[PDB]
Amino acid sequence: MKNVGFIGWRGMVGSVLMDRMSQENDFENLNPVFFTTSQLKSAFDIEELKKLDIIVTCQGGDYTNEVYPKLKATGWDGYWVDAASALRMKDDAIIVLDPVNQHVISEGLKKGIKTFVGGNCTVSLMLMAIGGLFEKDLVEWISVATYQAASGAGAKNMRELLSQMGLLEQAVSSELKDPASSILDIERKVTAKMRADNFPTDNFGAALGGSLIPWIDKLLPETGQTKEEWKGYAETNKILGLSDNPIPVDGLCVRIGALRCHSQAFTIKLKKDLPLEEIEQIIASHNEWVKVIPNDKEITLRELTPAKVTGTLSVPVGRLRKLAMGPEYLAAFTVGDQLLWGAAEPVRRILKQLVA
Amino acid sequence: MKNVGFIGWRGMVGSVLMDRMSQENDFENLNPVFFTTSQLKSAFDIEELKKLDIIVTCQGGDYTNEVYPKLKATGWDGYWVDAASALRMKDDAIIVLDPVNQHVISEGLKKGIKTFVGGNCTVSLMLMAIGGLFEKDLVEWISVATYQAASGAGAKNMRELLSQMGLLEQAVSSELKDPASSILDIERKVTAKMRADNFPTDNFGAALGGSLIPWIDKLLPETGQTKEEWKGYAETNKILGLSDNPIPVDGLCVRIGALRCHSQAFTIKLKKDLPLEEIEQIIASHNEWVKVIPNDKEITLRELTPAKVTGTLSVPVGRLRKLAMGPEYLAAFTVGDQLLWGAAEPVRRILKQLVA
């Protein structure tokens, strides 16, 4: 059994990984060594890390940027599996999403790649839903509008969102309890609360509960995209292995008041005209997690929502139909859990492949 | 002075209208006669209505389809101003948004048009934001992704939303106050509450607070769009007077946890390659309400949100940049109040013109 070191296993993402691994009994297929940054082995002890065959870290980019270089320099030839974005774009690093790019991964191992990094949550969740179309070579480009959850920003962000929602209701607790109060008076109070100085907004820098934030991460002055939107085009193509002939994936990344699921509205420009039924089949057949949701109201309300998807490995995709722009224009909406396929799952899966 | 009858002036939309008219002292330029359905004239007394010059109704579609044809039959020669969607697509009716279609309105008045209806909130808020691009005949098509407020659905929906948010927080109130509590334990509890049978979801048919619903109104079998999405193509063009040579407008209408502001993500295909700076100038110049928000984080966070725009007549538009598909592909995000330009304001304005 391979000796695997775990770093950052107590963080939010790291905790989801430990749970999923335990749930699947992955620990009986490997020898785990747990590291810590607290003053268990020290996550900063290069000598100890070099004894390992594989290192799985959910610690973050700063840690990776500090330790990874030192360890590689020792001559260490083991595998580094990372959830952080730090090494995704390195030429000696492969972004993993095995249900989608198992071939890229297989060839990469054969090539001697020793670094595998999970991809951006929005991109991996998109590929898990729409992967069938890319596999059949049908996508020319994709216009994206996201509805991203707080978990992407962090645990304290999730907490702030919950606190905000609580205070908004509290502002009109009395008014709401009597069925005949003025709804406009109620919103004046809620909105006044949202704009108040004591309204907790330090994590987001703006209210999220009862609102939305059309900006995620930093701006890349050169394109005008935020880093989050930039990863859609950059990461989608590196994952699929189309960096030299990249497929345009761009849009706006917006944060909404949800906890763990990212939702995305798509305008997909296909290369050819196909029957809707054929398109649906191509999508549903790609993997066992995607779930095609019929374009029906009651079914959509029950299946295509964060309420339904949270904490599950299911990737529903629905509202599938042709758009007014042309028969080659397809509309689609998907919902997926940010902490699972968007974070811990690709890492848990590549790990299982490395220790088999 | 013109004798104007008001119906539904006590409902949410009618109340905004009444408040706005008071704020602008519109009642000084007309003789108001208020109607009621309670057992002040009766909203159903066709003889009373027939004595007025204009009828302004925010009562709703069922009322209009009941009384309107019956009053028109008495030979009534006055004007019918409606906030409901019932008559929007009638050939003897014009959808009003004067800052955008004053010419269509003016021509219609001279022609003898007697029925003026406010337009769909999403289409109106969209045109108030990028009306400059249509004005310049620069739009080839537009794919839309909306983040719609509860107010669009109704007053009780706003209340359900606020109540859902309160419950979600109350389910983890003590844990949230504990700075060392597990975020995963907190989410597990919030999510359980959201799925509880007793979670108030009768108005939306699903959870909205902490989630989203990618479906608004009824399905339109013919195209697969919901009626809300269908209005994009139908109403955008009727408002602009382009029903004979339609511009494609389509996308996905999604409901989120906001009280009264609709937000929209746009992918706009322009007819020519224009510098971004030029495009912003074209957008900012169309009307006095649209506000171009520079593509900067801090300004965007403070200006382009429901939190900022709620209850105001401002229609900010930002995140403007060229998309990866090409220099003729424009990204844009806007936020607008659903009850003002989306409902009462276009009605308030056409009435001012009718009583001049």
UniProtKB/Swiss-Prot annotation, chains A, B:
Entry-linked CDD domains: ASADH_C_bac_like (cd23938), VcASADH1_like_N (cd02314)
Share an example GO biological-process annotation for this protein.
lysine biosynthetic process via diaminopimelate
Residues recorded as binding substrate, renumbered to this chain, are 148, 228, 255
Which residues does the record give as phosphate binding sites? Answer: 88, 231
SUPFAM superfamilies listed in its UniProt record: Glyceraldehyde-3-phosphate dehydrogenase-like, C-terminal domain, NAD(P)-binding Rossmann-fold domains
* Annotated NADP(+) binding sites: 10-13, 37-38, 59, 151, 338
User: Keyword Cytoplasm, does the record have it?
Assistant: no
User: What is this protein's function?
Assistant: Catalyzes the NADPH-dependent formation of L-aspartate-semialdehyde (L-ASA) by the reductive dephosphorylation of L-aspartyl-4-phosphate.
> Domain text from the record?
Consists of two domains, an N-terminal nucleotide-binding domain and a C-terminal dimerization domain.
- Its name, as the record gives it, is Aspartate-semialdehyde dehydrogenase
Organism source for this protein?
Haemophilus influenzae (strain ATCC 51907 / DSM 11121 / KW20 / Rd)
